[PDB]
């Protein structure tokens, strides 16, 4: 198709490996580019950890208000919110918000601990029908993005379908789903990624990710004005261990898709 030819040209121009999945919820049609190849998730994995904790809160009604202690030994490499609360507490809701909207890595590790380790995040993916997602490590080593390594990867097709379920479908209870949507819409890290390639009047909720090998990711739910929502996943990685991030590639891929 025309869109696939333009995505292939974008990929060639970029020197990296690009994976795209679009789901148009108007007719459940899909557009895929390297849709079944594995890519390192990096921080896009934080959506699954937050959703897993939301799922626990359907039975444990007060769970999101539970205080969790932030100790100096909890801090890892990037903790923009957790650092403001060292030797204090944050609730699981505040940690979920920090993980999603500021990509706070300490927040992610507390969410993983609440679920009983990476195996508990993976379990939730299996429970909602995602057989592809795997979380193997904690922050910050899940971002190593080594070529060929299956750890901490998913495919664009699998993540688009799962993000659809979580935000527009009914994998979560109604209060939980609405909370997830509100968190994603208030992301602060996405201005140069998928959002930059879309009309300024469209509402977007997204989660970015970045890691070694110039890995640059973004997953988004998109509500166009007077038109059914779309789910768009863009993953990108590069051959050099020290490559710079390429958020412009994600913006350009979104623009090519939006042209359809």
Q: Is there a contact between 123 and 133 (Cβ–Cβ < 8 Å)?
A: no
Dist. CA 174–CA 186, nearest whole Å = 19
Residues 154/108/217/135 CA torsion (nearest 10 deg)? -10
Tell me how the structure was determined. Answer: X-ray
Known catalytic residue at 43: yes
CATH topology of domain 2-260: Beta-lactamase (3.40.710)
DSSP 59-124: TSTTGGG-EEEE-GGG--S--TTGGGGTTEEEEHHHHHHHHHHH--HHHHHHHHHHTTSHHHHHHH
Show Cβ contacts of residue 215 under 8 Å, excluding neighbours closer than 6 positions.
39, 40, 42, 143, 145, 209, 235, 236, 237, 238, 245
* Residue pointed to by tokens 């710079």: 244
Per-residue HEC secondary structure of 91-102 comes to EHHHHHHHHHHH
Annotated catalytic residue: which of 13, 14, 43, 193? 43
Instruction: Judge whether 233 and 20 are in contact, CB under 8 Å.
Output: yes
- What distance in Å separates the CA atoms of residue 211 and residue 143, rounded to the nearest whole number? 5
Q: Which two tokens stand for residue 238?
A: 């590069």
For the chain, give the DSSP string.
Answer: -HHHHHHHHHHHHHTSEEEEEEEETTTTEEEEESTTS-EE-GGGGHHHHHHHHHHHTTTSTTGGG-EEEE-GGG--S--TTGGGGTTEEEEHHHHHHHHHHH--HHHHHHHHHHTTSHHHHHHHHHHTT-SS------TTGGG---TT--TTEE-HHHHHHHHHHHHTSSSS-HHHHHHHHHHHHT-SS-TTTGGGGS-TTSEEEEEEEEETTTEEEEEEEEE-TTS--EEEEEEEE-SSTTPPP-HHHHHHHHHHHHT-
Question: Residues in the chain, how many?
Answer: 260
- Cα–Cα distances in Å, from 191 out to 21, 112, 185? 20, 27, 12
Q: Among candidates 205, 209, 248, which has minimal Cα distance to 229?
A: 205
- Return d(Cα 110, Cα 196) in angstroms, integer: 31
| Pairing status of strand 17-24 against strand 29-33 | antiparallel
Question: How many other CB atoms are there within 10 angstroms of residue 133's CB atom?
Answer: 21
Structure tokens at 164: 């659809």
**Among 119, 129, 103, 130, CA closest to 208:** 103
Query: Residue 167's Cα: distance from chain center in Å?
Result: 12
Query: Angle at Cα 137 formed by Cα 77 and Cα 107, nearest 5°?
Result: 45
Integer Cα distance of 119 and 57 in angstroms: 19
- Residue 25, CA distances (Å) to 16, 185, 228, 229 in order: 29, 18, 6, 6
d(CA 62, CA 66): 7
Strand pairing of 203-211 and 67-70? unpaired
* Strand 230-237, strand 215-223: pairing: antiparallel
Residue 49 pairs in a beta bridge with: none
Q: Is the four-CA dihedral 233, 19, 38, 118 of positive or negative sign?
A: negative
Structure tokens at 136: 């193997």
């Amino acid at each position: 198709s025309a869109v696939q030819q333009k995505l292939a040209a974008l990929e060639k121009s970029s020197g990296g490996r690009l994976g795209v999945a679009l789901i148009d919820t108007a007719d459940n049609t899909q557009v895929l580019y390297r849709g079944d190849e594995r890519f390192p998730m990096c921080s896009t994995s934080k959506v699954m950890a937050a959703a897993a904790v939301l799922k626990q809160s359907e039975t444990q009604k007060q769970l999101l208000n539970q205080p969790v202690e932030i100790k100096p030994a909890d801090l890892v490499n990037y903790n923009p919110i957790a650092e403001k609360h060292v030797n204090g507490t944050m609730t699981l809701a505040e940690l979920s918000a920090a993980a999603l909207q500021y990509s706070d890595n300490t927040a992610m590790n507390k969410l993983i601990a609440q679920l009983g380790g990476p195996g508990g995040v993976t379990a939730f993916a299996r429970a909602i029908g995602d057989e592809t997602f795997r979380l193997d490590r904690t922050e910050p080593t899940l971002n190593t993005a080594i070529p060929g390594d299956p750890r901490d990867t998913t495919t664009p097709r699998a993540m688009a379908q799962t993000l659809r379920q979580l935000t527009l479908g009914h994998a979560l209870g109604e209060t939980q789903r609405a909370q997830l949507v509100t968190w994603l819409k208030g992301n602060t890290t996405g201005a140069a990624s998928i959002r930059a390639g879309l009309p300024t009047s469209w509402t977007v909720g997204d989660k970015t990710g970045s890691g070694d090998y110039g890995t640059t990711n973004d997953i988004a739910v998109i509500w166009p004005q007077g038109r059914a929502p779309l789910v768009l996943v863009t993953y990108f990685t590069q051959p050099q261990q020290n490559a710079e991030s390429r958020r412009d590639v994600l913006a350009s891929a979104a623009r090519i898709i939006a042209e359809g």
